[PDB]
Design an enzyme around this catalytic site. Sequence first.
Site, PDB file in Angstrom:
ATOM      1  N   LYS A 176       0.833  -1.202   0.000  1.00  0.00           N
ATOM      2  CA  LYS A 176       0.000   0.000   0.000  1.00  0.00           C
ATOM      3  C   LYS A 176       0.872   1.259   0.000  1.00  0.00           C
ATOM      4  O   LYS A 176       0.609   2.205  -0.749  1.00  0.00           O
ATOM      5  CB  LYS A 176      -0.941  -0.001   1.215  1.00  0.00           C
ATOM      6  CG  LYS A 176      -1.804   1.246   1.409  1.00  0.00           C
ATOM      7  CD  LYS A 176      -1.135   2.388   2.192  1.00  0.00           C
ATOM      8  CE  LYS A 176      -0.698   2.029   3.630  1.00  0.00           C
ATOM      9  NZ  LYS A 176      -1.788   1.642   4.562  1.00  0.00           N
ATOM     10  N   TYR A 215     -10.513   3.185   6.464  1.00  0.00           N
ATOM     11  CA  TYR A 215      -9.213   3.664   5.997  1.00  0.00           C
ATOM     12  C   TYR A 215      -8.752   2.935   4.719  1.00  0.00           C
ATOM     13  O   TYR A 215      -8.160   3.552   3.838  1.00  0.00           O
ATOM     14  CB  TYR A 215      -8.152   3.588   7.115  1.00  0.00           C
ATOM     15  CG  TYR A 215      -7.581   2.229   7.360  1.00  0.00           C
ATOM     16  CD1 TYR A 215      -8.251   1.301   8.134  1.00  0.00           C
ATOM     17  CD2 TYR A 215      -6.336   1.873   6.824  1.00  0.00           C
ATOM     18  CE1 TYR A 215      -7.716   0.044   8.360  1.00  0.00           C
ATOM     19  CE2 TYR A 215      -5.794   0.639   7.049  1.00  0.00           C
ATOM     20  CZ  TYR A 215      -6.476  -0.276   7.806  1.00  0.00           C
ATOM     21  OH  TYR A 215      -5.923  -1.506   7.998  1.00  0.00           O
ATOM     22  N   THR A 231      -0.512  -3.272  12.547  1.00  0.00           N
ATOM     23  CA  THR A 231       0.701  -4.070  12.609  1.00  0.00           C
ATOM     24  C   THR A 231       1.505  -3.890  13.895  1.00  0.00           C
ATOM     25  O   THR A 231       1.841  -4.879  14.556  1.00  0.00           O
ATOM     26  CB  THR A 231       1.557  -3.853  11.346  1.00  0.00           C
ATOM     27  OG1 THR A 231       1.034  -4.700  10.326  1.00  0.00           O
ATOM     28  CG2 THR A 231       3.006  -4.225  11.558  1.00  0.00           C
ATOM     29  N   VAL A 254      -1.872   6.626  11.214  1.00  0.00           N
ATOM     30  CA  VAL A 254      -1.795   7.486  10.072  1.00  0.00           C
ATOM     31  C   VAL A 254      -2.613   6.778   8.994  1.00  0.00           C
ATOM     32  O   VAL A 254      -2.467   5.561   8.786  1.00  0.00           O
ATOM     33  CB  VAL A 254      -0.329   7.716   9.622  1.00  0.00           C
ATOM     34  CG1 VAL A 254      -0.249   8.255   8.192  1.00  0.00           C
ATOM     35  CG2 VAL A 254       0.392   8.672  10.568  1.00  0.00           C
ATOM     36  N   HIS A 308      11.243  25.711  12.684  1.00  0.00           N
ATOM     37  CA  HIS A 308      10.758  26.516  11.555  1.00  0.00           C
ATOM     38  C   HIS A 308      11.726  26.427  10.385  1.00  0.00           C
ATOM     39  O   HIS A 308      12.944  26.443  10.612  1.00  0.00           O
ATOM     40  CB  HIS A 308      10.705  27.964  12.045  1.00  0.00           C
ATOM     41  CG  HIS A 308      10.146  28.947  11.068  1.00  0.00           C
ATOM     42  ND1 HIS A 308       8.814  28.977  10.720  1.00  0.00           N
ATOM     43  CD2 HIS A 308      10.715  30.017  10.465  1.00  0.00           C
ATOM     44  CE1 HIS A 308       8.593  30.004   9.912  1.00  0.00           C
ATOM     45  NE2 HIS A 308       9.733  30.651   9.739  1.00  0.00           N
ATOM     46  N   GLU A 344       5.612  22.373  13.383  1.00  0.00           N
ATOM     47  CA  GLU A 344       5.621  23.434  14.403  1.00  0.00           C
ATOM     48  C   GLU A 344       4.222  23.939  14.767  1.00  0.00           C
ATOM     49  O   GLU A 344       4.018  24.420  15.878  1.00  0.00           O
ATOM     50  CB  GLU A 344       6.509  24.614  13.983  1.00  0.00           C
ATOM     51  CG  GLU A 344       6.086  25.321  12.721  1.00  0.00           C
ATOM     52  CD  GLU A 344       6.946  26.532  12.401  1.00  0.00           C
ATOM     53  OE1 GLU A 344       7.201  27.336  13.322  1.00  0.00           O
ATOM     54  OE2 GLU A 344       7.359  26.682  11.228  1.00  0.00           O
TER      55      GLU A 344
END
Lengths: 451, 451
Positions: free
Chosen positions: A51, A178, A312, A343, A440, A445
């Site tokens: 994937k 998902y 996993t 995620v 930055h 941030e």
Amino acid sequence: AMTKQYDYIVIGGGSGGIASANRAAMHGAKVILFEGKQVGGTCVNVGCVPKKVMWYGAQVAETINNYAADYGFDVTTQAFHFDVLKQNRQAYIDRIHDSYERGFDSNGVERVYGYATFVDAHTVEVAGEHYTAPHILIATGGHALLPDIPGSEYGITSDGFFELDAIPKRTAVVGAGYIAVEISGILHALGSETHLFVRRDRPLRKFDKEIVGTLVDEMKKDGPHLHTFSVPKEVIKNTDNSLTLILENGEEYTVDTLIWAIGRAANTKGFNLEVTGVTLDSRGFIATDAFENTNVEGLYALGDVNGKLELTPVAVKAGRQLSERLFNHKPQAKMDYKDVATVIFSHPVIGSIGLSEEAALDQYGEENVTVYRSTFTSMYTAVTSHRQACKMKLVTVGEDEKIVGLHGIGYGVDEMIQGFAVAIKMGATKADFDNTVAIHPTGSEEFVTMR
Amino acid sequence: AMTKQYDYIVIGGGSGGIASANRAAMHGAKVILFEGKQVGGTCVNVGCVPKKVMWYGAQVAETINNYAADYGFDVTTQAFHFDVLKQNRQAYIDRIHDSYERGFDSNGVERVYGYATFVDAHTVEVAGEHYTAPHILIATGGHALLPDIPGSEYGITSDGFFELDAIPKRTAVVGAGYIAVEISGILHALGSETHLFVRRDRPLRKFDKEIVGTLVDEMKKDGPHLHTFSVPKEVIKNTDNSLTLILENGEEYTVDTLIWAIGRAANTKGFNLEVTGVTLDSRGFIATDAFENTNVEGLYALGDVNGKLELTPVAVKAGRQLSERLFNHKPQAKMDYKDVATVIFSHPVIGSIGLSEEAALDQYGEENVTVYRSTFTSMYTAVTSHRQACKMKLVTVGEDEKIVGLHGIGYGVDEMIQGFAVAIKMGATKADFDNTVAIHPTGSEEFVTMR
Ligand SMILES: Cc1cc2nc3c(=O)[nH]c(=O)nc-3n(C[C@H](O)[C@H](O)[C@H](O)COP(=O)(O)OP(=O)(O)OC[C@H]3O[C@@H](n4cnc5c(N)ncnc54)[C@H](O)[C@@H]3O)c2cc1C
Ligand SMILES: Cc1cc2nc3c(=O)[nH]c(=O)nc-3n(C[C@H](O)[C@H](O)[C@H](O)COP(=O)(O)OP(=O)(O)OC[C@H]3O[C@@H](n4cnc5c(N)ncnc54)[C@H](O)[C@@H]3O)c2cc1C
Ligand SMILES: OC[C@@]1(O)OC[C@@H](O)[C@@H](O)[C@@H]1O
Ligand SMILES: [Cl-]
Ligand SMILES: [Cl-]
Ligand SMILES: [Cl-]
Ligand SMILES: [Cl-]
Ligand SMILES: [Cl-]
Ligand SMILES: [Cl-]
Ligand SMILES: [Cl-]
Ligand SMILES: [Cl-]
């Protein structure tokens, strides 16, 4: 032929089984692992790995198609060879197989590539030989569900998606989780006329609504066509071999390939589990306690088959902690299933830890929740003709503003979450975030500069 | 015309001055800010912002030139129009300018775009008018250094790099710090024959040696040509307008453009600072205590001019904390300069927090330091003909393995560090990392799975 004695038998060579078998061996257990298909299980062969390789391919396509011109590059795509992508994907996967075999040799894990069937609660049969151990781990994983409608057999599942040798001209992806979101995003990026069909209001219904709102808005700008309140009624195969999906609302869509991504269920059938006395829960997963014990002493279950959290790293850690418990004298060793970060490789990607704003309000009450949010345009896209939003938020509770949820959607979010997950596991508050100096210029941030 | 009276005068409209002026105004101070050049200072106009846009352009180039083919995309570049990139970069910067001016108006900060010169310790002159206040912040930043050699004037600095309207065919970049490494990396990716010259054995000498080892190896594979033990002797301008850099070792390199990135020094000259009695340290920076006080009551200094840490978020936070202290009755408010994270936009990216292995050993002693590592190939590059290493390291001390250093180099590392910075500021140990579940498949998970 006499029954072969082992300290530990692991059924399944996926994430959970491999992890537990290796850790048991590292603590001196005489371990044997059984795998009926390919080493690495779902994640390596038909899951996270292929994937992610495909998602990278989609990133390359997006760079060429959407952003390159605005960075000064006038480029033309002479051709797209899906076969090249697939061959490189599979070569990578084969190297992972090789690595697992070198690991088993190194750790002293025995393995037989054959399907294991129970003989009794402490004994299995593989290739005609019987094996027994006082400890048996059932880490058999799950499988994709197919809807019970006429023509269901014309669709493929995520497994079939990885078997494709070309991008279909037109693709239907049915589901709201998902997997449906990831697959539909990849197919669209790689050139398919892609349709995503969700049964209710939106995809990822249990996710934070504000974040999913941006997913939906960005998919509209660049992504599959989203069809809400879409309940499959039937699939017809036409004379020309195309497929027509018929919805309960009467609408019809004709595509070349249809992918069912409507859910996954435990692998509990076909291996004589009934003779073990192991109990299933109401959703069909193997019931377990906090230590992965089934109701039968000496039988354990972890990974996807126990239904707790289908990831996993969860299977891996649970498998390792079980082996610590069984073979390294740690009766309290167990998996921590709370605040596990994830995620979703959507476009743009979603990163998440803990509670949605909706769940926090439900649990703690509106008077005790304080949300911090930042919305901006990712610098990468901001300078182009395909500007993309990024939304981030912190869900906090009580007077000390303990962070119980952290979510983001946007470019680069996939690599930002892990570090914050360490801080959340340590009990981070908004003050802890405020005490951290920003880096930055980055997207990350924005998580520590909300006010 | 009498001297105008203010509560607070800020000399400098960069990161530090802007942040401090705005925060002071939010707490009721009558504030005036002076800026002799462009609002936003170095980071907005000739620093972090334009640098990052250029780095994204370099990432696009890398995708097209190095990785696309292995993902199945046969692409040809008809042309590269640097002007397009530069115009989009400048538009982005102009929007920041506009936003600052609107902010000053909203917050009540007065400003005059003119250079301020001291009259006495508490009084400055700008465009002929005199201004006085019991609180004056010197936030004047720094400037690029030029070598004292024949032909030094033919070279440009990082300011000049942003003034370029085209990528030079051949570029020499002289220096060993992050600016030299970033600029040379960008120039190479965007097509210049790029030569990086360092005075000793390697670039970034103060950074962890094993991380820099990966940088050097990857630069040799895909990056600028690195020349070590290379000390400039003179620069010759040839009749065809090319430049020849002559080194003390006798080597000569002919280029179109030469960039001096040899260091930066404090802006302390040209504005009559001598009349204030403010003391400079041995490196020429304005000396200050933990609260940014100079040796003269009523005079403060922060940002690059105080020499502590050359970073935008540092200047911002120190400027805000100073205003909290002076105008919001918080006598203990101050900047925390410990464990500030940084990202270097080299090729590949370096992310770092805290001590290198070498520094930790020196400080804590060999008997009290334990290091963990992960070394792998980034999945993105792993499937291509331009495979790139990723390396990560945790430097820990004592029996509890407190994390005193965290470092990474590789694809995506730029967005990984911020969250770990929160955890380190909270006092994370190796156990806290071990307790955190990985996110798969990501590069970031490798920070929490070391053994
Ligand atoms: C399309 C897709 C994408 C995904 N993406 C992600 C992601 O990005 N991140 C993430 O964390 N997770 C992801 N997952 C989930 C992840 O793949 C699973 O959580 C993980 O594979 C579960 O590991 P496991 O060990 O429980 O099961 P599996 O890896 O499924 O292993 C079970 C193994 O047992 C074998 N087996 C079953 N019965 C027997 C028997 N009787 N005898 C011998 N062998 C047997 C099977 O052949 C199989 O190999 C994804 C899943 C899918 C389907
Ligand atoms: C090429 C480059 C890349 C960089 N990349 C990064 C990065 O990725 N991340 C990061 O954190 N930092 C980065 N930096 C550093 C960052 O730019 C500085 O740390 C930051 O700009 C310092 O802010 P400051 O307010 O101290 O100074 P400045 O922003 O330099 O502001 C000082 C201002 O004072 C003005 N001035 C001086 N004297 C007077 C006077 N007498 N009267 C009126 N005005 C005056 C100047 O015109 C200037 O605008 C980079 C710097 C460079 C040069
Ligand atoms: O700066 C962007 C970036 O580094 O962010 C983290 C990952 O998403 C990478 O793919 C991506 O290139
Ligand atoms: Cl393992
Ligand atoms: Cl299938
Ligand atoms: Cl195609
Ligand atoms: Cl499911
Ligand atoms: Cl050395
Ligand atoms: Cl430090
Ligand atoms: Cl060590
Ligand atoms: Cl990855």
